[PDB]
Design a protein around this nucleic acid. Structure first.
Ligand SMILES: [Mg+2]
Ligand SMILES: [Mg+2]
Ligand SMILES: [Mg+2]
Ligand SMILES: [Mg+2]
Ligand SMILES: [Mg+2]
Ligand SMILES: [Mg+2]
Ligand SMILES: [Mg+2]
Ligand SMILES: [Mg+2]
Ligand SMILES: [Mg+2]
Ligand SMILES: [Mg+2]
Ligand SMILES: [Mg+2]
Ligand SMILES: [Mg+2]
Ligand SMILES: [Mg+2]
Ligand SMILES: [Mg+2]
Ligand SMILES: [Mg+2]
Ligand SMILES: [Mg+2]
Ligand SMILES: [Mg+2]
Ligand SMILES: [Mg+2]
Ligand SMILES: [Mg+2]
Ligand SMILES: [Mg+2]
Ligand SMILES: [Mg+2]
Ligand SMILES: [Mg+2]
Ligand SMILES: [Mg+2]
Ligand SMILES: [Mg+2]
Ligand SMILES: [Mg+2]
Ligand SMILES: [Mg+2]
Ligand SMILES: [Mg+2]
Ligand SMILES: [Mg+2]
Ligand SMILES: [Mg+2]
Lengths: 149, 77
RNA sequence: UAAGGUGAUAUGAACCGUUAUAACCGGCGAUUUCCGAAUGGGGAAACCCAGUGUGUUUCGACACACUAUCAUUAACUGAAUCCAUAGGUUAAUGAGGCGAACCGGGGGAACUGAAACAUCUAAGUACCCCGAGGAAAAGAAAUCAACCGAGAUUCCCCCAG
RNA sequence: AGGGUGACAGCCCCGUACACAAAAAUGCACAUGCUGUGAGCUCGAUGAGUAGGGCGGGACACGUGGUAUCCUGUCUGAAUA
RNA sequence: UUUUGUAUAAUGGGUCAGCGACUUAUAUUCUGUAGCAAGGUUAACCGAAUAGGGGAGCCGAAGGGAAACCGAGUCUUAACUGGGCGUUAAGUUGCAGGGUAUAGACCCGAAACCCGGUGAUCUAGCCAUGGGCAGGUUGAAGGUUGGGUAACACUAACUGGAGGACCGAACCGACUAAUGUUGAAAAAUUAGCGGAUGACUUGUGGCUGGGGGUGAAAGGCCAAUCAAACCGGGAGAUAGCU
RNA sequence: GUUUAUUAAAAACACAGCACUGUGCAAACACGAAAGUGGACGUAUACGGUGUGACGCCUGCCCGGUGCCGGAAGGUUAAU
RNA sequence: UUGAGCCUUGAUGGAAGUGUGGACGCCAGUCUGCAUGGCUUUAAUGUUUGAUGUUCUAACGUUGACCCGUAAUCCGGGUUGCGGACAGUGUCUGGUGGGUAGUUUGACUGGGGCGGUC
RNA sequence: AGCUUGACUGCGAGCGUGACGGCGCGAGCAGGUGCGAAAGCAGGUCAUAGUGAUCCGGUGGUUCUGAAUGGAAGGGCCAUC
C-alpha cells in the first residue's frame, strides 16, 4: 500500500508525492475521502506525467520573452523627460504616473507606481539605469533625457 | 454462509493430527469480516462480507473493479 | 386393413357390419373432472374459501378465464434525503416437480484387517447432499524424455505385485 | 428357424428364405434458402495478490522422510523473453 | 455328536416328503496328460472371427556379488593351503486335478459398531384450552357485644369460615392375602387398603427425538422392549466358539 | 407428597427451612457450528449451581494431601 | 516521554583588562560556555528506528433514541448518542479439559482370585 | 616376579547342539606381534551364568550406488552406539 497524495496531508503530505502508508489509514480514511490513491502504476505516470508536463514544462513556458527587454537593447526615443529643478540641481518628483512621460510611447501604455527604490530618489545628472518592475525576475534597460525649455 | 463475497473463500475440511498422529475431522474457515467500503462512484457505502485478503484484493484491484465482478457474476452487493 | 364385430372374469341383452366411415392396427389432432410441483388463499391430498374481468326476449345470481414464488428484462411509479439509490405495481420470457443406471462435485463412517490396539486398514467404500449429459468428465504441454527423440485427452494390454 | 392343429407335420394353419410398402409424423444424412455468424493478411498484444515463501492441513502408490510435484485455511509476495 | 471314555440318567432328532453346506473368479506352485523343445507361448487388438494376423511381453537357456562389476565362474580376504553360492538333470503353453493367496471362500448363528430415516396416538415433563370432586366433621384469622383495665393487655359469648386439616363415595392410587399362573387377563379378579380443595384428578390439541428427550432420581419412562428406541442400510460385520 | 408402568412404596426422592458458591444485566447458566432463544419482559429481598433437609438445643479441633481462591519478584516455558 | 543510529551546530583525535553556571577536573591545574571594551570518549535539535503512556476517530461494537422503506418487537438504509482500534472473529500457539470419545488393563494357576512365578 | 598386549586381523578341515533364529568346540592356513636359549605357548580369564532378534535412528570408514549430466542429498557395504 504505497498510494500517491492529493491535498497536503499531515506527516507525509505533498500535493502528489510518493508515500508508502499503513493500509488502514488508506482504505478507511485517506482514499474514500479524497486524499490519496493506490500507486497502481497506471497512476505513477498519470501523476508523473505532471511532474514532467509542468515542473519542466510550464517552468519553461515562462521563458518566451527573455528579460522582456528584447529589441529595446538600444534605449528608447526620448519624447520628453522626467523633470528637473533647483536651478541646476534637481527638485521635482515623479508623480504616481511620471516615469513613462519619456518612454511614454514604446511598449504598451500603462500607469502605475510599482516603486522599486525606497529612497529619496537621488537628485543629480539625470540619466540612470536601475531596473524597475518588469516581472518577478527579469529587468530592463533605458535612459532619461531632460527638457531644456 | 461463511463465504467471502470477493474470493469465494468458504470453509474447508481437514484432520487435526495429534502427536500420536491421530486423525480428527475439523474445519479451516475464512477470516471474514463484512466491511463498509466507500465507493464514490456510487456515493454510497456498499458493505460486503469480505475475508481479509479479499480485502487485500479490493485494495489492489479496486472496489469499482470488484463490485464490477459480482454485478457481472449475479451477486447482490 | 378387412368379413366380421361392441377389451376381460362373463354368458346373455340390445345392436353394428359384409367392397368400404362395422371392427381392428398405425400417423396427427380433439376432449382430458378432482388431487398431486399444484401455482388465486387455505388445508387433516382428492376438500374449504376468495378477488378481479366478463356473460343471460328470466342480465337476481350462477357458469367461463385470469390472479403463486423466484430470476433476467422493460414500462409506469417512488422514501429517510432534493437529485439519486432503496422500495411499489404491471407486463414478456424462463425456472419449479418426477425418474433407472452411468457421470462431476460438496461432505463423509464404522464394524473389520493389523490374529489385542492407537499411527496404518477397511475407504474416499457405505450413506447424505448439489449439478449435468447422452454420455459425463478430461483435453491440445510452463508434458515427458535424456543429449537420440516424443508430441493433447480418454480407454485397453504390458511394464510389475 | 420356430409355434399351433384330437399322438412326433418341410407340403394343414401361422410363419420362415426372399421380395415389396406409407396419407401422415418423425430420425439421420446430405444438396439448398433464411436469420444469423464470423472468414483471410499485415502490425500488435501474450492471463499478479498470480508464481514463490512461513505456518496448518489435504492430494500425489510416497504415512515429513533426504521429498521434488499439486490444491489452499492463515499470513506474505516476484520476474515480465 | 463330543469324548480318555457314552446303552448312558451327556448332545440332536415326533414321523414323512422337498430343499439344505468345500463353490466361483484371478493369480501362483506341484502332479497327471497333450503339443512343441533350446525353446515354448503370445495380450490387447485386427479379423477374411473357435482360422489367420498381432510376439508388445512373459517364462526358460548363467551365475556370483549389497553393488560398480566380473562371468562358467564369482564372492570373501592383501591372498587364501581355502571357504560360500554356482557351472554336471529342459524348458514352456494348454487341459484336468492337488495346495496356497485375494475375495463372504464349506454352511447356518451373535451380543454388538457405524450411516440415514420413522416414532411422545403407550409413557415422563411442559405449554394452551375445557370438565370433575356424593355426604359428614373440625372451626384458624378477622369482626361485634359484654366483662375488664387509668388505657392497652386479658377474657366470655357470638360471629366468621382458614387448612398439601379430619371421616368417606365418585375419581386417582396400589399396602396385604387367596385365586389365576397351556389365565376370563401377555400384571386380571376377589376381600380388605392409601389419597380424596390439591404439590389433586381428567378431556382435546400442542412442544421435547436417541448418546437425545423427559425424569419429586428407579437407570425410571420414551407404542406389551431401554445401562442407549424402532426401521432401513454398511452387511454375507467379526465368531482362534458350538 | 413422589417413586422402580409390570416381584422393592421404604428408612430411598421431594419438601418448607439452612448454608456455601457464581452472577452488574448483551448476567451467570442452558438449547444451538450460527442466526435465534430460554433465564426474564426478571435485575442482587433476583436469577443459577452444590450440599443440608421442619423445629428445638447445637454444630469443636485440622489447610499436610487433593480441589478451589489470590499473588505486577524470580526460575522454567509456545508459536513467532 | 523514552532505548539506539544518522545531519548537524558548541567539546577529546578580529586583543588585553572591569565581570558568570557546570567539572572525570595527575592533588590542588585549567577549562566549557556564559558579558563585555578603544571514521571515536562529550549537550540540544532535525530527525530514522522500536518500547511505554495519554488522548483522538475514521475501521469495528451498540441487546440507547429517532427517521424512512412499513399500519412491522425481523431486517435494511439513514441521523443521533455511547464506546473505540478496545472488544470480538480467522489462522497459529502453550495451558486446562472423563464434558465427550476410542482403547488398553498379560499369561501360568490341581477352578478363579490373593500369593508366587515368567 | 620379569618382560608384555594373542583380550590380534583375515579364514577354517572337521565336530557338537538346536524345529528354527541361533549358540558352541576346533586343529590348521596367511599377515603381523609378545614371551622363551630352544622345543614351543598365546585368536582372554579352570570350565559351564553375567543377557536383548528385527525396525528406526546416530557416529567413524568406504565413489559401491547417486533418477538428464557433473556434483551433492539419500541409499549400500564395514565398524560401532
Ligand atoms: Mg389451489
Ligand atoms: Mg398451496
Ligand atoms: Mg474398533
Ligand atoms: Mg483388530
Ligand atoms: Mg463436455
Ligand atoms: Mg529437441
Ligand atoms: Mg502466456
Ligand atoms: Mg467329558
Ligand atoms: Mg458300552
Ligand atoms: Mg440319550
Ligand atoms: Mg432312559
Ligand atoms: Mg428328508
Ligand atoms: Mg397428549
Ligand atoms: Mg385433606
Ligand atoms: Mg378419606
Ligand atoms: Mg380391589
Ligand atoms: Mg442402582
Ligand atoms: Mg415399553
Ligand atoms: Mg438396526
Ligand atoms: Mg463391510
Ligand atoms: Mg404418604
Ligand atoms: Mg413394581
Ligand atoms: Mg408394590
Ligand atoms: Mg436458589
Ligand atoms: Mg439427606
Ligand atoms: Mg438427617
Ligand atoms: Mg464442622
Ligand atoms: Mg470413557
Ligand atoms: Mg489365565
Amino acid at each position: 500500500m504505497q498510494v500517491i497524495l492529493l491535498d497536503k496531508v499531515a506527516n507525509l503530505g505533498s500535493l502528489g508525492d510518493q508515500v508508502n502508508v499503513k493500509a488502514g489509514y488508506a482504505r478507511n480514511f485517506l482514499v474514500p475521502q479524497g486524499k490519496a490513491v493506490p500507486a497502481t502504476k497506471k497512476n505513477i505516470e498519470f501523476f508523473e506525467a505532471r511532474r514532467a508536463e509542468l515542473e519542466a514544462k510550464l517552468a519553461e513556458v515562462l521563458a518566451a520573452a527573455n528579460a522582456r527587454a528584447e529589441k529595446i537593447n538600444a534605449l528608447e526615443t526620448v519624447t520628453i523627460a522626467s523633470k528637473a529643478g533647483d536651478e541646476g540641481k534637481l527638485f521635482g518628483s515623479i508623480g504616481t504616473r511620471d516615469i513613462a512621460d519619456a518612454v511614454t510611447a514604446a511598449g504598451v501604455e500603462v500607469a502605475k507606481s510599482e516603486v522599486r527604490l525606497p529612497n529619496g530618489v537621488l537628485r543629480t545628472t539625470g540619466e540612470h539605469e536601475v531596473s524597475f518592475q518588469v516581472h518577478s525576475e527579469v529587468f530592463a534597460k533605458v535612459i532619461v533625457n531632460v527638457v531644456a525649455e | 454462509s461463511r463465504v467471502c463475497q470477493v474470493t469465494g473463500k468458504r470453509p474447508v475440511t481437514g484432520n487435526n493430527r495429534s502427536h500420536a498422529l491421530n486423525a480428527t475431522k475439523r474445519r479451516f474457515l475464512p477470516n471474514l469480516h463484512s466491511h463498509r467500503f466507500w465507493v464514490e462512484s456510487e456515493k454510497r457505502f456498499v458493505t460486503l462480507r469480505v475475508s481479509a485478503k479479499g480485502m487485500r484484493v479490493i485494495d489492489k484491484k479496486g472496489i469499482d473493479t470488484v463490485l464490477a465482478e459480482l454485478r457481472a457474476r449475479g451477486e447482490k452487493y
